[PDB]
Each structure stands twice: as C-alpha cells, then as structure tokens.
Amino acid sequence: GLKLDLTWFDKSTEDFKGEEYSKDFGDDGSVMESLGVPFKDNVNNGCFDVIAEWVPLLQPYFNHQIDISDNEYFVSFDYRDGDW
C-alpha cells in the first residue's frame, strides 16, 4: 500500500545525499491526513517540501535523523499493491 519516500539534499553543495522509505501503511492514509495532505489526490503525484512542524511527526518512521538545518527534505507519497 502507501509508503512515504523521504529524500534529503545537502543545503551547501545541494547534491542528492540519501533516501529512505517508511513502512507500508496499507490503505490507511491517516498519516497523510495528519500532515494536512489529502490521500487519494496526492499519492504518486509529486514531491512536498518538509516544513519544521512535520519533522517530529515523520521522525518515528525513519532511521535517518531528520535535521532541517543541514539538509533539505522532500517527501513523496507512493502507493502500490500490498507488499513491496
């Protein structure tokens, strides 16, 4: 089902540094609703800049330690048939 695709870039050199997917949330788009982004209309449809208020809400799903002072972050909401 739904997975969050997080990518980060260095603010200085601005090169693509890393990427990490969240666990599969299945058909529940609550995580997106909690971010203020409608589910059905925004999946597989572009990237969103990660703002400060999003950091703590997203952190529990990633091993990468999100630091918006050093990196620029983008999140895209990908959806595919269960079990990736």
- The torsion angles phi and psi of 33, rounded to 5 degrees, stand at -60, -40
Q: How are beta strands 2-10 and 47-49 bridged, if at all?
A: unpaired
Site for a second copy in 22-81 (CB under 8 A): 43-47, 72, 74, 76, 78-81
- Indicate which single residue of 36, 46, 56, 60 sits in contact with Zn ion (rule: CB under 5 A): 46
Phi-psi region of 55 (alpha: psi -120 to 50; beta: other; left: phi over 0): alpha
Q: How many residues bind Zn ion (CB under 5 A)?
A: 3
The residues binding a second copy (CB under 8 A) are 9, 14-17, 43-47, 72, 74, 76, 78-81
